[PDB]
Amino acid sequence: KQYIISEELISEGKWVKLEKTTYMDPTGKTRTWESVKRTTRKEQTADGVAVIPVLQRTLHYECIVLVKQFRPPMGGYCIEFPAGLIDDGETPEAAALRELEEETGYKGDIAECSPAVCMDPGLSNCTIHIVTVTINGDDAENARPKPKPGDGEFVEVISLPKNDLLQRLDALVAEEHLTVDARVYSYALALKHAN
Amino acid sequence: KQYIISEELISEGKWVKLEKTTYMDPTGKTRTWESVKRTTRKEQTADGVAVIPVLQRTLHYECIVLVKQFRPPMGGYCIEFPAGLIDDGETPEAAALRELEEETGYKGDIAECSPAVCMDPGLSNCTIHIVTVTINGDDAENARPKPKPGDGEFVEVISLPKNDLLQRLDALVAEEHLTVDARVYSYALALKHAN
Numbered sequence: 001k002q003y004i005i006s007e008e009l010i011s012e013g014k015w016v017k018l019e020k021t022t023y024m025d026p027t028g029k030t031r032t033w034e035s036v037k038r039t040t041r042k043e044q045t046a047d048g049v050a051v052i053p054v055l056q057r058t059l060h061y062e063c064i065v066l067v068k069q070f071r072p073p074m075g076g077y078c079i080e081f082p083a084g085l086i087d088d089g090e091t092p093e094a095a096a097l098r099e100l101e102e103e104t105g106y107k108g109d110i111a112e113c114s115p116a117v118c119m120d121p122g123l124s125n126c127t128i129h130i131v132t133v134t135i136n137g138d139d140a141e142n143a144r145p146k147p148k149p150g151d152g153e154f155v156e157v158i159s160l161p162k163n164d165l166l167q168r169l170d171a172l173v174a175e176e177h178l179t180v181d182a183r184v185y186s187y188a189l190a191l192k193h194a195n
Numbered sequence: 196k197q198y199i200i201s202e203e204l205i206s207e208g209k210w211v212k213l214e215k216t217t218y219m220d221p222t223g224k225t226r227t228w229e230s231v232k233r234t235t236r237k238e239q240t241a242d243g244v245a246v247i248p249v250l251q252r253t254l255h256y257e258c259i260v261l262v263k264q265f266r267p268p269m270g271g272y273c274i275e276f277p278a279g280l281i282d283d284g285e286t287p288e289a290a291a292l293r294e295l296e297e298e299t300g301y302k303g304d305i306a307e308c309s310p311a312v313c314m315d316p317g318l319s320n321c322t323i324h325i326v327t328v329t330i331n332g333d334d335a336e337n338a339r340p341k342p343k344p345g346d347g348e349f350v351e352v353i354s355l356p357k358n359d360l361l362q363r364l365d366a367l368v369a370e371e372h373l374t375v376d377a378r379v380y381s382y383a384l385a386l387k388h389a390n
């Protein structure tokens with residue numbers, strides 16, 4: 001019963017545009033709402049992808065591969081799943097494998113892929129696909145993974161034991177100031193609640 | 196290794212502002228970045244909270260209480276953890292318990308509270324505390340959960356089985372074509388992987 005009535009541009013930068021959205025609520029009243037959108041958005045399946053890289057070594061605890069990097073908006077360093085934008089004609093799965101190899105050097109196999117999910121529904125219209133990728137750590141291919149970071153992309157790789165993710169995450173945040181990503185934390189939480 | 200140089204504003208609204216962030220890469224080079232920030236942010240505290248409500252009845256498997264509501268930026272309906280901003284001087288736990296009762300009618304108890312985690316570090320400085328809250332669904336006090344939403348808040352309540360959260364989520368995303376929050380889904384994936 002609720003729908004977008006109109007969208008008024010407020011401002012716009014190269015990458016992001018700020019705008020005011022008017023919409024109709026159930027009762028029948030008209031309301032506004034300040035939203036954020038990525039200008040670089042085409043008619044695709046989603047904006048980007050987040051990769052959950054599960055490093056699997058025989059006779060070893062599974063590991064989750066995470067990346068650490070400076071985030072200007074945060075004014076500091078954050079711990080996140082490897083992530084990046086999807087290219088034209090590119091499949092979410094294909095983008096996941098590509099992005100994972102760029103940031104960490106690992107070459108994995110698709111495990112599963114989510115439908116498009118919203119990053120922060122109360123702010124932007126940004127969506128991503130969450131792709132679960134397994135990485136054969138015994139495979140010679142993944143022996144000594146070599147990351148090919150983008151020119152201007154400074155990323156550190158961090159593999160944590162899946163069996164103890166949350167606790168290992170706290171150990172870093174306590175070792176130094178550092179912001180864990182909400183999605184990463186949500187994942188680590190569910191690992192404890194499940195069992 | 197990397198540090199902020201300046202945060203020069205670009206534009207602003209009543210709730211959200213757009214900024215130009217100047218920083219230094221590890222090589223000493225001055226780079227720039229377009230960052231979004233909520234103007235409604237109180238110091239000494241994160242932007243808001245996300246609540247993970249575990250509904251507990253003796254006759255049923257544990258459920259996770261989610262909320263569906265129209266999100267203007269997404270131009271559609273979203274399924275998220277009950278969430279909201281943290282009032283001044285208020286504690287994340289108190290904000291989480293309040294926000295839960297308002298949107299769902301449930302009276303819960305704190306299980307745990309995460310540190311400040313980022314919502315979308317590549318885009319914004321938005322952070323939240325993920326507060327896990329248990330709900331005794333057998334207590335007569337939670338017999339007929341009667342919500343009390345504020346100004347223009349139209350929220351529908353959806354409790355889904357913990358041991359099959361992801362299956363239910365995917366179903367909803369297809370049928371009603373609405374969107375599931377990235378943090379809700381990440382949590383759902385870990386539950387599935389962990390079982």
Ligand SMILES: Nc1nc2c([nH]c(=O)n2[C@H]2C[C@H](O)[C@@H](COP(=O)(O)O)O2)c(=O)[nH]1
Pocket residue numbers: 015016083084085227228229230317318
């Ligand atoms: N909002 C914003 N996004 C940017 C800027 N520069 C820039 O490369 N981006 C986008 C495209 C990059 O691939 C992406 C970096 O995020 P990831 O590393 O998660 O892909 O952000 C900028 O100045 N502002």
